[model samples]
Target: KVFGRCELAAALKRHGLDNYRGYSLGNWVCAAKFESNFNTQATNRNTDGSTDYGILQINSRWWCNDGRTPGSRNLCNIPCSALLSSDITASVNCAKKIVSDGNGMNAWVAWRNRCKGTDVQAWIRGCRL
Candidate 1:
């Protein structure tokens, strides 16, 4: 989920979202399609009604200060550090927590299941949420 896809895949081999480095773009397409439908501005409310935002559906509202600064070192703010920086390239670094720590294919499969039978581009073009 870092470096968006191509770069991220290059950084972590099979941990990436595409086939750039032995990973599958179909898997990445399916996973990302499932996660937030490729919406770079997607957001959702957790069970507690808290919000999550961004391509990875990070909870942007938490880290944003006047909608400018968007990241944090605190527990609820991990994405802020890795993702919300100036360089979008930096966001890939933020995705490490999700890719690492033993999640591995679990996330990829989960997102595929979420998007399940959905088409890849349709997720990008059809949805507003």
Candidate 2:
């Protein structure tokens, strides 16, 4: 599912992403925009033979197991395929784990590149959260 801006914001908020780790709902929304364009089924293969999956593009190298990434830690303890589900629960939970692991939102490069230090409030601007 390709979520609209406000739609995605509401969903993230429902999952406790608003003010999570001191990051606002807008920051999460901005990260999703730049990471997967709100597409639940998005995937990207990295140069290190690892793949990123789902809306947040959680990586196979350390987060999820895809049976293809060499030395995958699978810290999320979930199949990479789970991240692609439209439910987004697994993806959001793994993202929370990533943040709790001290990576903050910087666990996602897109968040660092596009959302970090930016006016992410615009990303969820009119969202009735």
Candidate 3:
């Protein structure tokens, strides 16, 4: 499923991530833009063979299972496919857990490479929320 940028911003805000887990909403927005471009159906296979899942692109290596990927930790207790849907509640909850576990936005490579210390105000600049 595809989402407009502001539509995703409002949904994320409704999920209480406006300033969640010590990261700004701008950080989240920036990460999402780089990670998945607001496409819930997004998936990417890494060089190590681990796959990234959904909007936040949670990794199958430790976060969720792709079934065929043996030894996956499945720490989020969700199937990787579950992340590829328009409903993002599970993804948000798992992301909160990831942040709580001390990863913060650093759990996302996009955050480090693009969002960190960068001016991300434009991410939500025109959002109606």
Candidate 4:
């Protein structure tokens, strides 16, 4: 499922990501755009053999266990495959855990490069949230 911008905005808000950790929903919406383009099935393997999974692109290195990433922390206690589902619940939950770790939205490099310090309101503009 490749979610439209507004579709993702509504869903993320419903899951309580609207203002999670002081990062607005726009930050999340922007991150999802740069991370995986809202494609639920997106996956990218890093040179270190760790893979990123799902719409939020949660990584196998620390967040989810894929039985392949060496020394995976699996802090989310979920299989990486769970993040690839269209449901997105698992992805949002894991992302919340990631942000709660005190790193905030910087947990994602994509967010840092594209969303951080920007006026992200445009990401959610006109989305009837």
**Candidate 3 C-alpha lDDT tens digits along 1-129:** 888889988999999998886677888888999999989999999888899999999999888989867678999999999898889998998898888877667888988998899998789988899
C-alpha RMSD by candidate, in order = 8.4, 0.8, 1.0, 0.7
Write out the backbone clash pairs for model 2. none
Report the Cα lDDT for residue 69, model 4. 88
TM-score, ranked from best to worst: 4, 2, 3, 1
Better of 1 and 4 by lDDT: 4
For model 3, the stretches where C-alpha displacement exceeds 4 angstroms are none
Q: In every candidate, how many clashes are there?
A: 5, 0, 0, 0
Which candidate gets the maximum lDDT versus the true structure? 4
> Between 1 and 3, whose TM-score is larger?
3
Clash pairs for candidate 3: none
TM-score of each: 0.46, 0.97, 0.95, 0.97
lDDT of 4 by residue, 1-129 (tens): 999999999999999999888888999999999999999999999999999999999989899999998899999999999998989899999999999998888889999998899999999999888
Q: Which portions of model 4 miss their true places by more than 4 Å?
A: none
In candidate 1 the C-alpha lDDT for residue 107 amounts to 44
How does candidate 3 fare on TM-score?
Answer: 0.95
Q: How well does candidate 1 match the true structure in TM-score terms?
A: 0.46
The local lDDT score (0 to 100) that residue 19 gets in candidate 1 is: 41
